[PDB]
């Protein structure tokens, strides 16, 4: 999913 | 490096490590989003606006009969994006635990999910002339450059007339970056467009996701057929  | 070829040095382990990782992830929305469940609604709202352009405005408008949710997980997108807009939805995902939980997660509207395909996208062939929309979100990083191109080409053969494929995923600032946690890659805009266009698909729309947290990779949506 979203990542830093 | 600008290709999976260089950053993926063992293709077998690239796939098996990711399969192992998702096998032990909790079947929840917070698991589907790696601790970023708080942006699910923001994500779905933008996806809805992005897709409504093709479903409403003609004259070659996209149909609403059936959609395919690729890398669907427990059905986060199927539940809030696809099922309200499409009469029937198929799901495909490599993790058995997510497909099993999807039955409970999707609730009563989950009855309109026709097939729960358990397959890696690199081995999956959607049925010809079956889908008005094929939605591929946050999973293209789990395929090699070649497998992604070949999967997109197989998706092209499964679209109904006026159907579209939608990719929504993280983009790297430059090059291809390997994530050693979940065994996936992140590619920049130039690499993704090249893989799309050089695979024989036409790019119809492209839109950067706004209002995201500052600390995360940029997210782009692509419409193609």
* Numbered residues of chain A with Cβ closer than 8 Å to any chain B Cβ: 1-4
Nearest to B77 by CA among B108, B110, B55: B110
The two structure tokens encoding residue B28: 């929840």
Angle at B131 between CA B129 and CA B133, to 5 degrees: 140
Nearest-by-CA chain B residue for A1: B33
The DSSP H or E segment spanning B207 is strand B203-208
> 3-class DSSP state for residue B21?
helix
* Numbered residues of chain B with Cβ closer than 8 Å to any chain A Cβ: 32-34, 36, 39, 138, 170, 179, 186, 212-213, 215-217, 219
* CA atoms within 13 Å, Cβ hemisphere of B15: 13
Chain-chain contact of B33 with A3 (C-beta, under 8 angstroms): no
Of residues B32, B39, B170, nearest to A3 (C-beta): B170
Chain-chain contact of B33 with A1 (C-beta, under 8 angstroms): yes
Interface test with chain A among B21, B31, B32, B34, by most A beta carbons within 10 Å = B34
For this entry, resolution in Å reads 1.8
Most distant CA pair in chain A, distance: 10
- Whole-angstrom Cα distance, residue B22 to residue B186? 17
The two structure tokens encoding residue B191: 């690499």
For B146-169, give one letter per residue: b (16+ CB within 10 A) or e.
Answer: ebbbebbeebbebbbeebbbbbbb
CA dist list (Å): B51 to B2, B40, B48, B141: 30, 16, 5, 22
Alpha helix segments (H runs only) across chain B: 4-7, 11-23, 29-32, 40-56, 76-77, 96-105, 145-156, 189-197
> 3-class DSSP state for residue B58?
coil
- Whole-angstrom Cα distance, residue B64 to residue B163? 9
Domain containing residue B5: 1-225
DSSP B119: -
CA dist list (Å): B192 to B32, B57, B188: 23, 27, 6
Domain count of the fold of chain B: 1
């Amino acid at each position: 999913g979203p990542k830093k | 490096r600008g290709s999976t070829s260089e950053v993926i040095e063992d293709e077998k382990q690239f796939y098996s490590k990711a399969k192992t990782y998702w096998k032990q992830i909790p079947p929840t929305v917070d698991g589907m989003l790696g601790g970023y469940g708080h942006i699910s609604s923001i994500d779905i709202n933008s996806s809805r606006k992005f897709l409504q352009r093709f479903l409403r405005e003609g004259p070659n408008k996209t149909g609403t009969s059936c959609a395919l949710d690729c890398g669907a997980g427990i059905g986060r997108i199927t539940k809030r994006l696809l099922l309200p807009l499409f009469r029937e939805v198929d799901m495909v995902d490599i993790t058995e635990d997510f497909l099993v939980q999807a039955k409970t997660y999707l609730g009563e509207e989950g009855k309109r999910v026709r097939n729960y395909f358990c397959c890696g996208l690199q081995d999956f062939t959607p049925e010809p002339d079956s889908y008005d929309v094929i939605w591929i979100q946050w999973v293209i990083g789990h395929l090699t450059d070649q497998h992604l191109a070949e999967f997109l080409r197989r998706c092209k053969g499964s679209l109904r007339p006026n159907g579209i494929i939608v990719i929504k995923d993280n983009m790297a600032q430059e090059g291809v970056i390997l994530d050693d946690v979940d065994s996936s890659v992140c590619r920049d805009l130039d690499v993704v467009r090249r893989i799309i266009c050089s695979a024989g698909l036409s790019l119809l729309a492209e839109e950067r996701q706004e209002n995201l947290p500052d600390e995360i990779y940029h997210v782009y949506s692509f419409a193609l057929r």
